[PDB]
Amino acid sequence: EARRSHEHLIRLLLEKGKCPENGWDESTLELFLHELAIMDSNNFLGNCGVGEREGRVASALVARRHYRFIHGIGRSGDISAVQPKAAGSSLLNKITNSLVLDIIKLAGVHTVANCFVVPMATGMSLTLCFLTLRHKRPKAKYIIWPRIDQKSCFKSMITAGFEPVVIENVLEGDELRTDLKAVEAKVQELGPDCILCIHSTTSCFAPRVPDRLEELAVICANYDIPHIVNNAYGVQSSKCMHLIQQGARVGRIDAFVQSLDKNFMVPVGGAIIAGFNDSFIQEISKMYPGRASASPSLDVLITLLSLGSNGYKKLLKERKEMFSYLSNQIKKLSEAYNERLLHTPHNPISLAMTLKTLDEHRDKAVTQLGSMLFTRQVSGARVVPLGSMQTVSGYTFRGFMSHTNNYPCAYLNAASAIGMKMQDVDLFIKRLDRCLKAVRK
Amino acid sequence: EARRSHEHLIRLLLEKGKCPENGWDESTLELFLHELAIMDSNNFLGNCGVGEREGRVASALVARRHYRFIHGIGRSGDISAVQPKAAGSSLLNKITNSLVLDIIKLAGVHTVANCFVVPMATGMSLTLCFLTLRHKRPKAKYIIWPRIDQKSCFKSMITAGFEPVVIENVLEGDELRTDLKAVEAKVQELGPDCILCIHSTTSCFAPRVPDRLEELAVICANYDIPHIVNNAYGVQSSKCMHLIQQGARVGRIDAFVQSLDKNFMVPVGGAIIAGFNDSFIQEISKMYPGRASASPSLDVLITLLSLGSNGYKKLLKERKEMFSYLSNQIKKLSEAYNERLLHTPHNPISLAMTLKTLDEHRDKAVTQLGSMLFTRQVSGARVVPLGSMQTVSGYTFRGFMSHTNNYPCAYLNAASAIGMKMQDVDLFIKRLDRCLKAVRK
Amino acid sequence: GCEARRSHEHLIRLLLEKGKCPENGWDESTLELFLHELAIMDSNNFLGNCGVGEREGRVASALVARRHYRFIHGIGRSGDISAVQPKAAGSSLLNKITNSLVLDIIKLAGVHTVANCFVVPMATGMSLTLCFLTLRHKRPKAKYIIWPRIDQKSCFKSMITAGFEPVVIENVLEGDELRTDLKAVEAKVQELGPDCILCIHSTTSCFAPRVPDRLEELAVICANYDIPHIVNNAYGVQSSKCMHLIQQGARVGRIDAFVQSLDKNFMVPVGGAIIAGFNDSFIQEISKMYPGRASASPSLDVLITLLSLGSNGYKKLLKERKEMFSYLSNQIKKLSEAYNERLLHTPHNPISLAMTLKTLDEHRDKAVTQLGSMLFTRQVSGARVVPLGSMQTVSGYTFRGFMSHTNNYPCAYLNAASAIGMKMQDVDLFIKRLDRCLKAVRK
Amino acid sequence: GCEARRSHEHLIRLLLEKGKCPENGWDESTLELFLHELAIMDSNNFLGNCGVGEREGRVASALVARRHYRFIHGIGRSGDISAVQPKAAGSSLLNKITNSLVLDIIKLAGVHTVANCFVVPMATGMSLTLCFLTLRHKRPKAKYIIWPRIDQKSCFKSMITAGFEPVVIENVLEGDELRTDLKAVEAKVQELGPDCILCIHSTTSCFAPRVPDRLEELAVICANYDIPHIVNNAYGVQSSKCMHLIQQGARVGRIDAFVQSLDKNFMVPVGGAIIAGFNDSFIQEISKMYPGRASASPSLDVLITLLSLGSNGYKKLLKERKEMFSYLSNQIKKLSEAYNERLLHTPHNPISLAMTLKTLDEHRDKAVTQLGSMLFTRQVSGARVVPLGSMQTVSGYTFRGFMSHTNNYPCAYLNAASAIGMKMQDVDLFIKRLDRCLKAVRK
RNA sequence: GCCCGGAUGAUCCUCAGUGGUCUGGGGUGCAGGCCUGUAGCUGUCUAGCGACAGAGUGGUUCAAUUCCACCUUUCGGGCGCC
Ligand SMILES: *Cc1c(COP(=O)(O)O)cnc(C)c1O
Ligand SMILES: *Cc1c(COP(=O)(O)O)cnc(C)c1O
Ligand SMILES: *Cc1c(COP(=O)(O)O)cnc(C)c1O
Ligand SMILES: *Cc1c(COP(=O)(O)O)cnc(C)c1O
């Protein structure tokens, strides 16, 4: 009976709800998971069910792959409530949220008040935030939104039933940045009462850079306007998390959203809503109708308990290193072809190399390069050609994917995101070169 | 090389996208699943990723438990679009939707036009429907809603940012039913233009019964008002599915929603949106911002391929049998205590036994019985006491859980839902008796 | 809330107290909780672990570690396959328990007087060999093993591998059946002398038309001449007839050990066996004759299985085999008529059946050998086809009329058996595919 | 889209063509695709299946079927553990391949001249026994096995289980080391006569202060007197020193077979071994001496492992063991000084180290025996403690000064070894816990 | 079992024919005076009355029983000499 050392790791978790510093062994992890699962009624031995929702499972494969967690999280009114029918799942939800909160502090935002995991995409998660704000601000019709050419967060505003006010970005050197004048101009033109919130974005593709959060946080605190931050994959960026921390300090940040897959290397499908006003975060929680999947929370729990805060820190560290490596490698490859690495110092995660030497009109070289890269099995390589027209839920974007009507050149994206390895870079550079050379002939 | 017999089962699936009549063996199933998984870029061998979302997975346990399906379903604009980054997942989504459509026909609604799985609860899934309708009907403020005391679908209307018009139910014998007069009275009072849609419910707890769908479908077709059906767990009920089929025939049904767990015995977290106008169903699909989890679609795929349409039919058949068995068993137990089985012929799934012999005021017997049942490990047993006051998102319900301000008596719920076994019933009856006897002393 | 575990613990504590099969099969949840609880008792899985030995339990592949529920150290110590291993308390405990359940099953199955038994991670043939190896030291003058013929290479070679010379006693034709030639056995005990005989090696489960050896008679011959008696019960645990017969032998004569296969009697993967006896002492001797540690895989497999089925589970399987043996039989009768063949009368075989194939010309159309592969390509396994005049050499010994258990059986025949786990669909598929197979030959 | 499979197929086709370890480890996805592809080739997994046999591959527990990747039929046929099984083409193929990878690894590891080898689902001790069993038939007059002493019950008992009488040749003290007494061996060949000797049984991998037997010298003695030579290479595959030594013996003398454990050399669960030789012929003879079918579990485990590690993977492990052996050593030196003990000089052992424990009074404070369990409760496995004057009886033979490999070794000592898979944390944890363990005894 | 094609799967049964709201040959059960009129199914709702759908899955096409793919079944052909 030295299972006391497992008991001890577990007792420590339940007591302080923080990430283990060093990862648990699978043995401890699975032991724990089973102790939880058997607390859910559907797994009770002496159990009869006479309800419509009893966690009955027809496939052994399904039961096993979810570690016998079938009931989901929350009750009918609360995606945060305890349900005597699934005591184990309820406890699971509480812990994983706590672990997440811990990581969010450790990642940069130490003054985060509260947060919760929600089994939706980042897009829908933002929508939930807008749906919640509507009730707090019934006269509001518009969301003010510093442009970013990513369909999910844009659509999120329309799905919620509000009208986006696209605030274009100001070009500074090579970087696209927040037009603080225009924002404050609009809030005045439309009037704060009519503004649902300011919807800013941190993580994004170069040449766009993380919005001027603190400046916006002030505009928001001043005019009493809610500030929601799309931090889709900014948790892995101490620069990004710092911005959030700061804006909340000198100003107002009502909620920030991040994606589970982009920040924690788990399957697509979950997100985190986080804030500094505890009461308001829970209002968003309460806005969710019915129970939700536990699958994303389970993945997060498993990943974090397995990595430990140390494991996570390591990854964050490697990410930075890979960023330099990638940047420096692109500078070199870039030279050999008379292109350059766009000067985007303020973007911690994403880089862009120019493609001015390829002409997209005579022959479709810039487009052609996109396909070649794909067929050569290079994912994430994002070619951005000049002058793309595109409609998204009625609104028409000029020069779409460039984040502004008329950017100087066509370029190509790459990023050091969490999990990336040197091989990723070397193979990229190796294959990008091969593609460029191919386009010459 | 007799793997031709596996190839053949699979080729048959892809070709006609129907449920196998008889279940596949795990061997075939897993073979298939792996062939899909390896079509997703993240699983390619010669793959480098330089994006922010590459399906990177830190836990081997996570990767394995999802059969290496990490990318989710859909793209940024479409939870139904193909993504070259996840060809396998995209194909997975298409097939599982097809299988589902097949089951939905086979279950009663043969004239279903289109449907899709969505990684949300039934509550949020309904919300999505309201969020979509808003754009089609910008002047609309209210949803007309024949009362049902279930927090999730009620909240769903408010989360979507609309105002519920609670239409009370008419008592007929022991049954609570649709007040068709009041509905048409309200549509006239408020005016069709101001009505977002009529929100009816089929599956529910006795003594409420499935709404008069066809009659409502007509009111809706007449006044040009959208009709959305909460069919939460009605797929398992040929009576319920028939109603839907019919309403669509003599009238208008724009979309019906069902829950994945309640109808297919998989973990809580997914739902199905289904309709008869193909174009409109896809409009709801397009309304979803960003990618979504594949976890619910994978469970459904696995379950159905494993059961086959035969397996499913068997379950549906057993459900009916269990219903009689349960009903007849309650009639008997009921007698011995001078209670009775409420006369609710029109409710195919749920039964109710009275509890008039226990007085909830002197001693709290009706409440006490609820706890005793729980501690004795009987789930689904739903005690409904008289006169419960309760607020849900501002609105105050009188006699909550009874579905009407003043129902004749206190009663107790039980249901034959899919998956239930005889043991469930016998243990229930055995333990309910034991509890009642206990309350006497 | 942590009282949900109470129900699980009751099931486990009960197992650890009495070591009997649970009457009703366990639930996967309970089973896996238990397995994990055992595995963390093993030193390799300790959290505060450092290893400086050459055998520490290290596992390179997670896949491997997972699939064996983190049981790595195998079973036993260097000295005893019986001894508890300080390094691996969990595996040790797993092993005590598996042997217990298996003993429990053996009684339930017909041999209620069974003294002791153990699982050994070898095939049946190799497990027999182990018995012989143990007997050698008890009988140093012994060179011969007396063996009523049965055409199956493993049990036959088990004797040669052990270092002895098989003395093949030909069978007696009694009606349709092939039975023990008791007079021939005694003749050989006398000719060679008891002191030169290591043991008599008898077989229970086997193919028709052969039937189980006359254990009672042989048990007495052995008692009288003071010769050990080893019984090959390969797949006889599923037969109350076979088991009761073993029990009878032990009651009236001597039976030193009976061996049976794991995969044939418990529907687990090949590779495991049970050695069982009526003298606790002697059984332990064979156990201690095993050199070093052994795989825990076969034990794990039967533990999981027995725990999942429960006494009732296993019993039910046993009943359904009988029911299927009746069915399969009638079906052969019917098919026989239709084709001018017959179901050879072999009442004394509870498992295997034989159908005639006289109407097939193998010396003309070679219809008998060609029907073999026909049943094969058409996906019928277990269907053994037996020609006349097969010659086969096995380790230097040449058999005449091989596969038939005698030099000249009346006719060519076809085997089919009702083994545990067989479902109605199995017979129906067999009968159908055979009818098609025979029609085909006509053309 | 179905071209994503192309990359996977290249890896597989390459494996099936040359049967060499992939240089770089496979990816789980590829590995599992392959395994499933094999398993569906087995008749038990066929879709159109009916079984009427007594051994059909039926599995009662899904758990069991899953954990074995649906490989149920085991390996071989009744005749050969070498023969392809019509019933189980998949398992057959799995087995050919495993043997191939293992052969590949054995060359890479030092014995480049290796003729053939096979995996056998038995322990090393039992696998040795099998070798002996095979030799018996080649040398019917043989009663004795000549064996340079090494205190380990399994390899010792392997000889008795096989039915022979071990002739224990005491070792020679040379410096700190214990080595082969070549003059003593020859004395016994002469006294007993080559014709009475089944074989000489030598050991490579072992505990300090003993070191690997002088294979070269012994290989020649064997060549001259025409005596077979069986080498116990239990955990020597991880040592290029041991392997090169085996290769040398084969070059200048005779070595009939060398046996090695699976779990000790490949970090898989206990229960498997490899029998290897330089005469393809003789190796096949031992293979055919195995009676019946065998478990596929041990083969599966090494296949998965080797396929996952790749040549490079395994090589790296081999390099890191060396590096750790250096480390562990220096660390013992340092600790020795601090405590007035020393690292016994045993340059000829590449794996095991010994530290003195002279400063401990076992006849006064019993400090030596009590430090044994101390290292144990404090969670240090593999740390063997060796007192003076241990007496032990093993199968009737009584050892004096047991565990030390001689009757009177100068001092009490403590073993620690750098076995494959050992990590720096292992040494550090050991050194720390030992320092604490020794401090403790002072009080 | 895998491969190759001829038919077949459910409008009283069987044969024959054929892209047009099916047309013949024969036979059978019930009704009426050889003639003439009708002749079964299953699934869902229903107390019942009765009503509502489905003739393999889909595809071509103004329209298919009648074409084309596939599936169910049944017949024939070749593969099978552990
Ligand atoms: C289950 C159910 C719902 C939806 O509940 P969710 O938790 O959102 O899946 C809605 N209405 C009724 C009557 C239900 O039973
Ligand atoms: C990934 C991402 C989102 C959210 O996308 P989902 O598919 O909804 O998770 C939003 N904005 C940006 C910039 C993103 O990269
Ligand atoms: C491990 C070992 C053996 C064989 O032991 P088994 O448990 O039977 O595998 C033999 N000799 C030595 C030196 C060993 O270390
Ligand atoms: C199966 C069997 C054996 C043993 O075969 P193994 O493959 O070694 O387990 C012995 N005799 C008979 C009659 C058998 O059926």
Determine the strand fraction of chain A and express it as a percent band.
15-25%
Rg value of chain A = 23 Å
Biggest contact: A-B, 109 and 109 residues
Helical run tally of chain A: 14
Q: In CATH terms, what is the fold-level topology of the largest domain in chain A? A: Aspartate Aminotransferase, domain 2
**Count of DSSP E strands of chain A?**
16
Assembly state (oligomeric) = homotetramer
Largest sheet of chain A: 7 strands, mixed
- Return the CATH architecture of the largest domain in chain A: 3-Layer(aba) Sandwich
> Which word captures the global form of chain A?
globular
CATH superfamily of the largest domain in chain A: Type I PLP-dependent aspartate aminotransferase-like (Major domain)
The CATH class name of the largest domain in chain A reads: Alpha Beta
Strands of the widest sheet of chain A, in order across it, are 2-10-9-8-7-3-4
- Bound ions, cofactors and other small molecules, one mention each: ligand PLR
Structural class of chain A: alpha/beta
Helix amount of chain A: 40-55%
Provide a descriptive summary of the structure in words.
The structure is a homotetramer. Chain A has 441 residues and is an alpha/beta fold. Chain A has three domains: 1-70, Arc Repressor Mutant, subunit A (Orthogonal Bundle); 71-307, Aspartate Aminotransferase, domain 2; 308-441, Alpha-Beta Complex (Aspartate Aminotransferase, domain 1), CATH 3.90.1150.10. Chain A is built from 14 helices and 16 strands. Chain A has helices at 4-16, 26-37, 60-65, 87-106, 122-136, 151-159, 180-190, 213-223, 238-250, 260-264, 278-286, 295-335, 365-375, 422-440; strands at residues 48-49, 114-118, 142-146, 163-167, 169-172, 175-178, 195-201, 227-230, 255-259, 271-275, 350-354, 378-379, 382-384, 390-392, 395-397, 411-415. The first copy, chain A, has a seven-stranded mixed sheet, sandwiched between helices. A three-stranded antiparallel sheet of chain A has the order 11-16-13, covered by helices on one side. In chain A, helix 5 (122-136) runs parallel beside helix 6, helix 7 (180-190) runs parallel beside helix 8 and helix 12 crosses helix 14. In chain A, 56% of the residues are buried. At the A-B interface, strand 1, helix 3, helix 5, helix 6 and helix 10 of A face strand 1, helix 3, helix 5, helix 6 and helix 10 of B. The structure holds the ligand *Cc1c(COP(=O)(O)O)cnc(C)c1O (4 copies). Chain B binds one RNA strand of 82 nucleotides through residues 1-2, 4-5, 8, 11-12, 15-16, 18, 21, 108, 110-111, 238-239, 241-243, 245-246, 249. Chains A, B: Residues 74-84 are annotated as: Phosphate loop (P-loop). Chains A, B: InterPro entries: Peroxidases_heam-ligand_BS, PyrdxlP-dep_Trfase, PyrdxlP-dep_Trfase_major, Sec-tRNA_Se_transferase, SepSecS/SepCysS.
